[PDB]
Amino acid sequence: PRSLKKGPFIDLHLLKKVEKAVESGDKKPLRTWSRRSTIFPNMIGLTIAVHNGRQHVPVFVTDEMVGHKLGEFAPTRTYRGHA
Amino acid sequence: PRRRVIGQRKILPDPKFGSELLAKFVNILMVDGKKSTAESIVYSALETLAQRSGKSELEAFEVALENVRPTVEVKSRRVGGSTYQVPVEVRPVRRNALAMRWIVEAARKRGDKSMALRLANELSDAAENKGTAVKKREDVHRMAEANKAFAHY
Amino acid sequence: NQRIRIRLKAFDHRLIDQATAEIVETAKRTGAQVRGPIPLPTRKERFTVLISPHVNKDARDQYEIRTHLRLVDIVEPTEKTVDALMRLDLAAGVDVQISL
Amino acid sequence: NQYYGTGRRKSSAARVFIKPGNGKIVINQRSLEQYFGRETARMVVRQPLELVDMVEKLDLYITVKGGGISGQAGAIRHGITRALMEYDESLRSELRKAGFVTRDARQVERKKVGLRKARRRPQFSKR
Amino acid sequence: GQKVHPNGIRLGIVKPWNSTWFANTKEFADNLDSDFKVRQYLTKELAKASVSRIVIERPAKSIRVTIHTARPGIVIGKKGEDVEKLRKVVADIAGVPAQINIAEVRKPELDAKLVADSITSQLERRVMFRRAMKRAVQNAMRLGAKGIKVEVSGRLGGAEIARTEWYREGRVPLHTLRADIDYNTSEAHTTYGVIGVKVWIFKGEIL
Amino acid sequence: AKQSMKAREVKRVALADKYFAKRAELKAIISDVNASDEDRWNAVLKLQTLPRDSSPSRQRNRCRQTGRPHGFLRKFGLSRIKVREAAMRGEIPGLKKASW
RNA sequence: CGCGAAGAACCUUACCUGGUCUUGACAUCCACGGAAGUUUUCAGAGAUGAGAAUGUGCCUUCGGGAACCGUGAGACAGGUGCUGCAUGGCUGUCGUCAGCUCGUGUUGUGAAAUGUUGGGUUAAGUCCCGCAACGAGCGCAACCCUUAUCCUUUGUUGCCAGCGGUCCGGCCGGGAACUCAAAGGAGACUGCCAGUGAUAAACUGGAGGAAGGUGGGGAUGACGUCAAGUCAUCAUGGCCCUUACGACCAGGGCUACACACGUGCUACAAUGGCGCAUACAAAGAGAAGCGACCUCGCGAGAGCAAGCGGACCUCAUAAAGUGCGUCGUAGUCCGGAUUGGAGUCUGCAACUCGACUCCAUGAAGUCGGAAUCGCUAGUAAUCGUGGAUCAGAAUGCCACGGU
RNA sequence: GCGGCCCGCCGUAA
């Protein structure tokens, strides 16, 4: 984890649209490629689709998941079992 | 080997007794290349045995050694198909080496606390002609005399 | 005047001996008191590379480069010494440094 | 006047000065038994004396550097033996037989390519 | 792969280096790269002459180049115009100013590089390899030498496995360090791939 | 390797040394112990804006002769194969075979 | 099978998904406009598109190169694409084993033989004697590096016996003795003695000497065998793609997991664990880098900042050992895997997928079936230290000393 | 002087 003397990492080009979709309606889920961004309280209640390498899958953000990364969801590897 | 090795390594005598047998004994008991602990163990065990015996520091040692000392043993020398384990005669240095190795190996297979106590106990038992150490001598002699038919070679 | 230090380094010993002999001789000619060519322990660095283009990690070679050092330390430069050094300074593959 | 000797071992060197006094085993400005941990080192350092002129008319100002315990003890013994040679020239006729004159030249080997140590090679369990 | 390189093993005994200069860690790689560039350019440019060996020495703020050859007139030209073109280009390649020199090869039948690339040039004109090998060995023995060995490898016309041949007479001891052995290689591109050439020349044992 | 790899390498070097100046103070104010909130925030949001192929960490040094990404040596700048053949030939001054 | 790889978060990167280009990301050509620029706004995941000022400067010999961009066409470039059974170069292996051949002359109708076989020796086709053979070549040995003993030369940043004071620190004055430093020489050759031996060649002991019988350790690998390995370091003969098998960008993968093998690390304890105090190495590295002293921190670290291109400074406290106290054979104040919480640091960026610190938790494990391998002396076993690759990152690799 | 221990696909350097 970061040093706490630098703060979380945002990847601004996501922030510039999360700031405009928070107030001017626009409840359409967003399209993004930044799996390395944190979850701020500003995003609460919104839906965002995150690329997993093959196609983006949408998630609905909640309150307890604030502080994690965008990629903590949307798993990449696909496995079912040896059968 | 196929060739012949000539010579023999020389070892310093014991610092506080001047006995090469003590040096060889502590060398055999030495593990990991840590001589100081081995000689500390040997000295503690010897003083305990001397107290429990009433003799000098060497008389008990020689008595215990002479209690467990091979005279003959078998050796698989073979002619014409089968093996025919036969008994042979043992030269003195081999006898001393075997005796000390058996003493130590019996020493390590006991549950008494600390090696020095164990070693003293087994030396005292050998002085009294009992214990696991004497059993090896006895059964080696037994096996050797069982095959006392092919010894013509 | 003061200490004047000359440090000499080269990858070969014959020409370093030649150069130190030449410099001590010219310094003695110009007129001053000089001291011995200190041997100044050498540096050796090794390398180890494997030779096969593809496999066989156990095939390797060892290479090294030696660097020799010599110290002169000419003391009390009387006169014409500095110009003589700045004019008589010729060597191929020899590095030379001078300090005040 | 005093006399000199030099002993060497695995990686140790010894400077020995001998003077006709009665008992002086200073080593690096320290006494013998305090410098050397209680072990056979004291036996080996006093060994080349008890057979000739058993530490009566002698002073043993000693300096040592490099190596470990046993190396330093052996180097000291070699230096002391060598120093006595320039005291009486007839002492060779016994020190030679004692074996203290010869300089031991055993030291560690290289680590060679493809081996874990000087001679230990990786386990060979190939079929 | 069994034989140690004959030239390298003797670099400190009876053989000199080809580049002689001193440097520290900062400029070692740059000096090596510059020497590689200049040697490559000279080899490309002076192919038509008989160039044998390039020695590069760095004076303090300078570079000094000497060329060994057997036909110096071609390299040096009618006047010093061509050596001047070479000097301009070389001083362009390496920043410091440059000076050029020419060496003279007295017996071209020695100096194995010349023999090797002569044989390659002959092979490029579709001549039987065996005649070339015998011719070279006979010439070298006639001019005076204690031994010589040549060898050729590759697809010598037949589609079958590439073959190998070699001839030798005299003495060519390779396990004695005192011996002065000259060794060099070359290769020729033909219509059926490349052919390798190696030459050993034993000028004489040195005390 | 291929030509495009070397082209990418040289472009990376150029972009790295073009913007070297400003990244220093950007990181300096990011790491400052007396920096306020808004300035540090703007710095962390602005250093991100630079072209990605500009950090020095985005460069793999490779052999000058060929461009091999493995087996590099900082001392000479060549891969193991080329340094071995050149050392045998006699290009490197001072190199020998170590025995000891 | 800890192999290419001396080091995988992006890059590396070849592979997958999607978004893009067509004389091209890298060269030579042809014709116009054009210092090369530098700052900066927007759309974008980004490639990339739009833009706005900044700029138009040399020799001018008057049009070119310098200067690079931006265009349009055509030769062309570009392929880690297939064939190691078309090849060069470079390695492994039998094997550091002692063998492998030729010229001339003789013998046989001929393939071939002789020499190279025989007696005695040696590490050795190493040597003597004999013999239709007489001589050579590549091999063996020697010439090379290092280690062990002395002698000269030089004496700082290295050394301190004698001298003087000295805070008692080689600290200073001094010294050139000793250690050491790196240059040059001496030394071992069965040299000498006795015995055995075909009055050879050699082999047993002895003296002397630091070293005695190729002193110890390396580097050096004959003719050839295995259609051995590598077209993906590199170079190449053939084919085969050219709006694509060429080129650019963002995310993902090379790290998956019912399982099976190879190579290692730590243990199962009392020759031990824990606490306190103390003592002896060698070899290396250092400028976009080694980083001291002080001050904050329990800690990983942070702030300020000297010195060092280095026998001067930093890395950098060696650990086993040795003295005291405790634990008392107990799945244990043995063992430390897994998991929770809280942090530091490198880097645009530690989710997949880094290394360390603190607190808590504390698993299997009580010496291992059939089987199997390494080592002959400073060697096995054991204990620590350094270096390369490298922003970051070793239980691997390559080196150094102690017992 | 005498214990036991079997097999190895088709073509293929010049």
Swiss-Prot record, chain B:
The record's listing under CDD domains reads: uS7_Bacteria (cd14869)
The record's SUPFAM superfamilies line, in alphabetical order, gives:
Ribosomal protein S7
GO cellular-component term (any):
ribosome
Q: List where the protein spans the membrane.
A: none
Q: How does it assemble?
A: Part of the 30S ribosomal subunit. Contacts proteins S9 and S11. Cross-links to IF3 and the P and E site tRNAs.
* Known role: One of the primary rRNA binding proteins, it binds directly to 16S rRNA where it nucleates assembly of the head domain of the 30S subunit. Is located at the subunit interface close to the decoding center, where it has been shown to contact mRNA. Has been shown to contact tRNA in both the P and E sites; it probably blocks exit of the E site tRNA. Protein S7 is also a translational repressor protein; it regulates the expression of the str operon members to different degrees by binding to its mRNA.
NCBIfam families (alphabetical): rpsG_bact
State the similarity comment.
Belongs to the universal ribosomal protein uS7 family.
Q: What is this protein's record name?
A: Small ribosomal subunit protein uS7
**Gene assigned in the entry:** rpsG
Swiss-Prot record, chain C:
Annotated PROSITE patterns: RIBOSOMAL_S10
Q: Record's InterPro entries? A: Ribosomal_uS10, Ribosomal_uS10_CS, Ribosomal_uS10_dom, Ribosomal_uS10_dom_sf
User: Which biological process annotations from GO are given for this protein?
Assistant: cytoplasmic translation; regulation of DNA-templated transcription elongation; ribosome biogenesis; transcription antitermination
Molecular-function annotations in GO: structural constituent of ribosome; transcription antitermination factor activity, RNA binding; tRNA binding
Q: Name one GO cellular component term.
A: cytoplasm
Which UniProt keywords are present, listed alphabetically? Ribonucleoprotein, Ribosomal protein, Ribosome biogenesis, RNA-binding, Transcription, Transcription antitermination, Transcription regulation
Tell me the SUPFAM superfamilies matching this sequence: Ribosomal protein S10 (SSF54999)
- Whether Zinc counts among this entry's keywords is no
UniProt lists the family membership as follows: Belongs to the universal ribosomal protein uS10 family.
Q: Subunit structure, briefly?
A: Part of the 30S ribosomal subunit. Can also form a heterodimer with the transcription antitermination protein NusB. Binding of S10 to NusB is mutually exclusive with its incorporation into the ribosome. The rRNA transcription and antitermination complex (rrnTAC) consists of RNAP, NusA, NusB, NusE (this protein), NusG, SubB, ribosomal protein S4, DNA and precursor rRNA; S4 is more flexible than other subunits.
Can you name this protein? Answer: Small ribosomal subunit protein uS10
> What is the organism field in this record?
Escherichia coli (strain K12)
- Tell me what gene encodes this: rpsJ
From Swiss-Prot, chain E:
A single MF term (Gene Ontology): mRNA binding
A Gene Ontology BP annotation from the UniProt entry = cytoplasmic translation
Q: What's the superkingdom here?
A: Bacteria
The record's keywords, sorted A to Z, are: Ribonucleoprotein, Ribosomal protein, RNA-binding, rRNA-binding
Signal peptide coordinates: none
UniProt KW Lipoprotein keyword? no
Q: Which InterPro entries match?
A: KH_dom, KH_dom-like_a/b, KH_dom_type_2, KH_sf_prok-type, Ribosomal_S3_C_sf, Ribosomal_uS3_bac-typ, Ribosomal_uS3_C, Ribosomal_uS3_CS
SMART domains given in the database record = KH
Family, per entry: Belongs to the universal ribosomal protein uS3 family.
Q: How does it assemble?
A: Part of the 30S ribosomal subunit. Forms a tight complex with proteins uS10 and uS14. With proteins uS4 and uS5 encircles the mRNA as it enters the ribosome, which may play a role in mRNA helicase processivity. Some nascent polypeptide chains are able to cross-link to this protein in situ. In collided ribosomes contacts ribosome rescue factor SmrB.
- Record-given protein name: Small ribosomal subunit protein uS3
Annotated organism of origin:
Escherichia coli (strain K12)
Gene that produces this protein: rpsC
From Swiss-Prot, chain F:
SUPFAM superfamilies recorded: Glucocorticoid receptor-like (DNA-binding domain)
Q: Which Gene3D superfamilies does this UniProt record tie to the protein?
A: 1.10.287.1480
Q: What GO terms in the biological process aspect are recorded for it?
A: cytoplasmic translation; ribosomal small subunit assembly; translation
Which keywords belong to this entry?
A: Ribonucleoprotein, Ribosomal protein
PROSITE patterns reported for this sequence: RIBOSOMAL_S14 (PS00527)
**One Gene Ontology cellular component annotation held by this UniProt entry:** cytoplasm
Q: Which domain of life is it from?
A: Bacteria
Question: Could you tell me which Pfam families the record lists for this protein?
Answer: Ribosomal_S14
Q: Name one GO molecular function term.
A: tRNA binding
Parts forming coiled coils: none
Q: What the protein does?
A: Binds 16S rRNA, required for the assembly of 30S particles and may also be responsible for determining the conformation of the 16S rRNA at the A site.
Q: Which family does it belong to?
A: Belongs to the universal ribosomal protein uS14 family.
Query: What subunit structure does UniProt give?
Result: Part of the 30S ribosomal subunit. Contacts proteins S3 and S10.
Q: What is this protein called?
A: Small ribosomal subunit protein uS14
Organism this protein belongs to:
Escherichia coli (strain K12)
Query: What's the gene?
Result: rpsN
